[model samples]
Target: FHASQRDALNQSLAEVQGQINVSFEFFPPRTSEMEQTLWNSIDRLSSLKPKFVSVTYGANSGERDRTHSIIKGIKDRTGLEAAPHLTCIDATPDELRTIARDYWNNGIRHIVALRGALPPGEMYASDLVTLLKEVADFDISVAAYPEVHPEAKSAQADLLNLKRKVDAGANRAITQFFFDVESYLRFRDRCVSAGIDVEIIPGILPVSNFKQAKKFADMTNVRIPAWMAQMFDGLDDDAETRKLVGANIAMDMVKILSREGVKDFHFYTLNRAEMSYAICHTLGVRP
Candidate 1:
């Protein structure tokens, strides 16, 4: 969030307050300026009274200390509940245990546990269920993919793999973002049939740049339909309209999901408030 642009955002957010429930997701910053941006974003958006804020773990064990610092700061500075993301990539079982133990000692009780992906040339591994089970005392969250992970054996197999995570110890599943509401609902229903009671919260990403967003999604095995790109085409120079379109699309996505009995949303806020705040406004989730 730009400091120069916050007043405008704050004014709009006031209108959005008291609508749908909201949560913000932020990545750890590397520099003082970026840290200022994060804190500014947090301070500006905190008035909405987030359900909880999340800090992401970087890929391949990158930026673990930075992530911890930011998450700890959020808990210390803001009264909001904070969830630290723990990734298994480039980390051993001992390291994971140490991290969980540290969080416990620091008065942090919630964790977003993930079998994170390794960087290039690293050994591929997937024993998160066992790991989570071993650390069952901590309130844990894990990732779920509806379209199947890229390296998964099969779709059904992936669902079973997800069930393994839940069976091991996960309290809730925050899914990879998807545009198709049916995909999330179907995943939820299937898990229910399989007796997986973990709450599968749909992760919402208000599109910023469709091309860039799709690229990220593709890297994570998320499928983006061609029509989605078409929607943002020819609007490269139109920032304001693009933001509006993004907010409108996200609002529609949540509205449809809400009709299907989804009362809670976990936003992948991208560290900006415009789209997230706007969607929450439409949903009637206010501070």
Candidate 2:
């Protein structure tokens, strides 16, 4: 039924453009202690002049409250561009416009709009932008999955959904965090061939804890190379070793990605500073 656009989705090996930009992702902290850590991490990384810091909206209740406050707080306190991850599945169109108005009134201008893999009632996907655009010139972003959305009918559905989002005015498409570099490269090539060109940034998750992240990885459908588990094998009790190996794993992935023409990296900071900070340092995205 979607064949008209199915024909659309390249591979050219190119070198990294000398300059690179990075962004970080944060979520509402469950405790005040974690809240402080989030800010500290923001302040610490702000020196690198990231494109923006995106706050995740939990797509559920009070977490929405934290997102509003935290993103506004980050913008006002750090003076850096702040983008709130607005899951489009969370609210009604009328009520959603009210929140968009609130964001603009508070000086927020960027957002990460997600359909939550299952969406409804947007008239067309363009309606999301139509609503946001009528509110203000918000710089919007969408998420893409290198491994393909686990819920998609096929990779075609996932890729086509992205094409539709870009046509709907997405400025950037930050990918789902991936470990297997080839997954991203192959996906990006496919994205290019689809004639939906925009800044496609890789989502980098520095796996600081193997067990927790392995399970998280499974849920997201991201591949964990068997070699990776071997790297962390028998080190379950060794936090320091995991951190070192984890950073290297992320660092090495970026090194290859960079040489292959990736110029932007979005870190799933996980609300911690040093790990993402250290990895960015190695990429020479330094203060």
Candidate 3:
């Protein structure tokens, strides 16, 4: 091989130069120790910078408190716009309005709205988006799926569902985490064909723990590549090695996706920042 000649992956990595945009997702931690550790993860990822960081919401009152509290925690510590993930699953319309008003009054400008199954105003994320806009013209994001939703009746239904959310005024769609770049590329093209005009950001999950990752993949309809399964073999007892391998895989995903005109990546950090931070560093995003 020539000394200066580079493969496409290496060339893309070399040219990254911190231009790859990213967002981080954090969920509410249950234990006190987990809370502190989650904050540590938050701090580390914060050093890499972000388009924003988001805290996942839950149905229970106490869990909801944790999300709001951590979101506020992010604001005070790192100055990132901490978008709260709110689902319309358990709350009534009145309850959602109350919560949205509270969020608005607290000066939280961005929300990741999601949905459930209740009549009148709680059926889908589209309804949540509509109701939320009525509360305030909040910047909102909704869900997408490159492999299609697990519970969707058909791929066509799932794609149209994304359009409904967009029509209801969602600002962007953050897709479910996926390993296949081809799936995302095809979905993005299909989105334009469907007239869904919004940023279709790809979600990347570094597979440091393949067991948990596989569980999510099965539940969410993501197909784990056979090569990834083969790579994870024989590393069951070596947590550190798994993370190194995971980081490499995630780096390649971002590099190739960036080469294909993807500017934004949303990392599902799973309450840990090491792998995501490492991948971002490899992409030339520095502290």
Candidate 4:
């Protein structure tokens, strides 16, 4: 799904690798072949020297236990810190604490804490604070959205909610991916002004597949600009060109951000090495 912009982006990543600190994101594989693909992707990207790798959690009716098992696998099989995502959605306070303690016992040092989304008919705000207060030991990362979460009542309310997560003990905040750079900077400014001390790291998902991303945007509440649709128009017939376009666009985006003093980056790799590798090459990343 990520080859369209692969080649050009890889060159750019190889060009800028050492100058930037990078981290990758992956999900649990659904099949044995998929598992093989995930491992190959990891092997290819590991030499780029990621700061740490993160595995996402099942939110809004996700498979919570499976998330933990896959995260544990990543930690055990690879020499990277595995930060499993935790949310206050389907899990309870006691459940979260047990999970956190297990992570500690297994040598996991970091966590991505979030006020997770609920399934149909469940309330997100009910007892949310208590659930978040469970993970106190590990370095925790919470979700931030310059565009606000899909389920938030309002922008102001969302920011306040983020503040609540911090008060509940989040160590850092990783933003939801955004196409607008201003959104991130403004969110950063607001967080700083509000006296939130957690480091806010922008999550950059290089748009590689517009069709695929549109479905995801529906789920996350990230607005898809109309212009983005126009850019991907008529490319379905041209997969090769699409991949190249996807890769270069991401490379260019990061280069622009790097010049803006964004030295650390978190890539939602989607377990596709070729695409990430291309972007990394263009960023000067090398084995």
Best by TM-score: 3
Indicate the residue-level lDDT of 137 in model 4. Answer: 53
In candidate 4, which residue ranges exceed 4 Å CA deviation?
A: 1-19, 60-65, 119-136
Q: After superposition, how far is residue 218 of candidate 1 from its true place, in Å?
A: 1.7
After superposition on all C-alphas, the RMSD of every candidate to the true structure, in Å, is: 7.0, 7.7, 2.7, 5.3
- Per residue, candidate 4 scores C-alpha lDDT tens digits across 35-139 of 888889888888787888888776664666667777777776777887887666656566766876777788888877655655465424323434534444557
Q: What lDDT would each prediction earn against the true structure?
A: 0.76, 0.83, 0.87, 0.74
| Decoy 2 TM-score against native | 0.89
Give the alpha carbon lDDT tens digit for every residue of 1-287 in model 3: 65443476677677878677889999888789988889899888888889898887755455787788888888888899999998877678889899999988887889999773233442678998999999999999998988988778999999999999999999989999988788999999999999999999988899999989989899778999888889999998999999889998998788778778888889999898888888888778889
From the highest TM-score down, the ranking of the candidates is 3, 2, 1, 4
Shift in Å, residue 33, candidate 4: 2.1
- Native-to-model Cα distance after best TM-score fit, residue 46 in candidate 3, in Å: 1.3
Which residue pairs show collisions in model 2? 8-194, 9-193, 9-194, 10-189
lDDT of 1 by residue, 194-283 (tens): 888888888999997776787888788887766777788888888888887778778768766765667668888766766777677667
Better of 1 and 2 by TM-score: 2
Question: Residue 63 deviation, candidate 1, in Å?
Answer: 2.2
TM-score of every candidate relative to the true structure: 0.86, 0.89, 0.93, 0.84
Question: Which model, 2 or 4, shows the larger TM-score?
Answer: 2
Q: Pick the candidate with the highest lDDT.
A: 3
Q: RMSD of candidate 2 to the true fold?
A: 7.7
